[PDB]
């Protein structure tokens, strides 16, 4: 008949949560506050990322109920933290600044975009003070009531200049699973985001995941295959976000074409602050180029795919975002060390019916960045010396709906968000952790009872 049997080694898993540790490659050298990013304490990857495709398997995933994104998000916060524990605490900066304009080109093609501020400051000696001066981007200075100004995050947060040894260059991170667990990767080129993925594989641990911080635009991400997938748990809901993932890396060239000078001010003892000494070179405006042709064509591919969720009898409109906080209004990202806020009006400005040249994006440069919408904390990037030229793909999109009022053909979508955990779900959607239970009870003609 059928009787009870015990096995050990039964390839069976459960959906579970557990902790996942980093796995990297040995390239830990940079020049802004510690290391490369945090990743030099990492265990070196196996030179053979062994995988195995699992025949016949069918497991439902839920890229919207996955937990790995949560661990990842907390850990990235904390690593940013640890990189910011040990370097200088810039509290005595929050001082009344005497600022004037920087007379940029007559009449105005930089509109200043930076003010020239002198101020009092402590010295090496807790004694007779010094008068220094520095150039600040008028986007991070605020008025009161020359005129007296101050740092923006000061009456709300403390600030913590990153010293010059870490990078911000994202380095491929490999989330690795401790023994007794397993990482499942959906091998299906065509996957909505959830539900049963038929073609799956197991890996000991994942691919390199460039942990780029970006808004409205997935940079350096992975690319989709044979289509440009759309992912969201409830498209019919207007309160989620649409995750578009391209086939073709649409280039973007961003640059800051200034030779900027690093002026060191000793907030003694021993602590030193890097201010913007001056700017030399072609004073253009920081910006980004994109091939208009490829963007238009690929966004038409997107038109097709958005249609496939709304009917071949519709008209879709891409508008720019509807205003608000800076960190959501723009394509914010990090690049060569600096922090870019690109206005994207020039990219969602078109309604679309049922059926070189290049686009220039004018971006501004911020300093006192408040990362992860967290308040009470504030990193202060240092003026990166030299000229910045930085090239990248844009592989995906993060859109928000406002329609379902007179909802027939004309839908309007605008970009936005502000939670990186979207960015993170865009590359872990194929991944799921399972706990292994190598203990098994099953019936065969081995026999025991109650």
């Amino acid at each position: 008949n059928l009787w009870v049997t015990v096995y050990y080694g039964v390839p069976v898993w459960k959906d579970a949560e557990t902790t996942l540790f980093c796995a990297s490659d040995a390239k830990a050298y940079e020049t802004e506050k510690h290391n490369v990013w945090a990743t030099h304490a990492c265990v070196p990857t196996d030179p053979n990322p062994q995988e195995i495709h699992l025949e016949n398997v069918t497991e439902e995933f839920n890229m919207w109920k996955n937990n790995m994104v949560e661990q990842m998000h907390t850990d990235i916060i904390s690593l940013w933290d640890q990189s910011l524990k040990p370097c200088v605490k810039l509290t005595p900066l929050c001082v009344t600044l005497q600022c004037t304009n920087v007379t940029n080109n007559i009449t105005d093609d930089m509109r200043g975009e930076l003010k020239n501020c002198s101020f009092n400051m402590t010295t090496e000696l807790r004694d007779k003070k010094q008068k220094v001066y520095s150039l600040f981007y008028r986007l991070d200075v605020v008025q009161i009531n020359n005129k007296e100004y101050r740092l923006i995050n000061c009456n709300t947060s403390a600030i913590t200049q990153a010293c010059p040894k870490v990078s911000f260059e994202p380095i491929p991170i490999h989330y690795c699973a401790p023994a007794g667990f397993a990482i499942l990767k959906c091998k299906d080129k065509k996957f909505n985001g959830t539900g049963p993925c038929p073609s799956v594989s197991t890996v000991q641990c994942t691919h390199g995941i460039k942990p780029v911080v970006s808004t409205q635009l997935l940079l350096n991400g992975s690319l989709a295959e044979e289509e440009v997938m759309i992912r969201s748990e409830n498209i019919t809901n207007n309160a989620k976000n649409i995750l578009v993932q391209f086939n073709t890396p649409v280039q973007i060239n961003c640059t800051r074409p200034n030779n900027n000078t690093r002026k060191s001010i000793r907030i003694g003892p021993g602590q030193a602050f890097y201010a913007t000494g001056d700017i030399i070179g072609d004073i253009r405006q920081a910006h980004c180029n994109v091939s208009k042709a490829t963007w238009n064509e690929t966004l038409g591919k997107v038109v097709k795919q958005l249609r496939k969720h709304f009917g071949n009898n519709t008209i879709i409109r891409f508008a720019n975002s509807s205003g608000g906080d800076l960190e959501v209004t723009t394509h914010s990202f990090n690049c060569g060390g600096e922090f870019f806020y690109c206005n994207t009006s020039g990219l969602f400005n078109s309604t679309w019916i049922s059926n070189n040249d290049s686009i220039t994006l004018p971006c501004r440069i911020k300093q006192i960045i408040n990362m992860w919408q967290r308040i009470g904390q504030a990193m202060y990037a240092p003026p990166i010396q030299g000229v910045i030229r930085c090239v990248s793909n844009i592989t995906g999109l993060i859109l928000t709906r406002d329609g379902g009022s007179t909802n027939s053909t004309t839908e309007t979508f605008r970009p936005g968000g502000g939670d990186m955990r979207d960015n993170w779900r865009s590359e872990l959607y194929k991944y799921k952790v399972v706990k292994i239970e190598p203990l098994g009870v099953a019936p065969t003609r081995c026999k025991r009872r109650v």
């Binding site: 008949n1 059928l2 009787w3 009870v4 049997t5 015990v6 096995y7 050990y8 080694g9 039964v10 390839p11 069976v12 898993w13 557990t18 902790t19 996942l20 540790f21 980093c22 796995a23 945090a38 304490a41 990492c42 265990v43 195995i52 699992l54 025949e55 016949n56 398997v57 850990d75 904390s78 690593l79 933290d81 640890q82 690795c176 401790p178 023994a179 007794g180 397993a182 197991t202 000991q204 292994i436 239970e437 190598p438 203990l439 098994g440 009870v441 099953a442 019936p443 065969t444 081995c446 026999k447 025991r448 009872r449 109650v450």
Partner: protein, 133 residues
């Protein structure tokens, strides 16, 4: 056949009935190697301790169901059919381990108790009986 880690997941239970060791090896990962607080350091150690803890829980379970000669334990006592009674072909010609656990997920804690109590106690004290002559 060298399937690999979980390599027989998409196979009938009798198929996986030969590739048991491959999962067992991965229960330490060897070289793993996985310095102050060091985010990912606490993670490393908490990981390793979790791993050995996990390992020892089940190895304990097997210690209790005293075999230690694992992958197979068999006695001569019949088995209760009440728990989702099914056919032999319904298992080996109709089911893989994955689908099987979905159905057996209820009776686990039950089975654990009697495999623990019954054979351990019966095989106990009989060795005590035969320690006389």
């Amino acid at each position: 056949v060298f399937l690999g880690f979980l390599g027989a997941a998409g196979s009938t239970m009798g198929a996986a009935s030969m590739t048991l060791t491959v999962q067992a090896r991965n229960l330490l990962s060897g070289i793993v190697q996985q310095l102050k607080l060091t985010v990912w350091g606490i993670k490393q150690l908490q990981a390793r301790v979790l791993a050995v803890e996990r390992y020892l829980r089940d190895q304990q379970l097997l210690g209790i169901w005293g075999c230690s000669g694992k992958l197979i334990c068999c006695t001569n006592v019949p088995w209760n059919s009440s728990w989702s009674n099914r056919n032999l072909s319904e298992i080996w010609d109709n089911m893989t381990w994955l689908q099987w656990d979905k159905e057996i997920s209820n009776y686990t804690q039950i089975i654990y108790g009697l495999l623990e109590e019954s054979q351990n106690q019966q095989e106990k004290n009989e060795q005590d009986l035969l320690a006389l002559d």
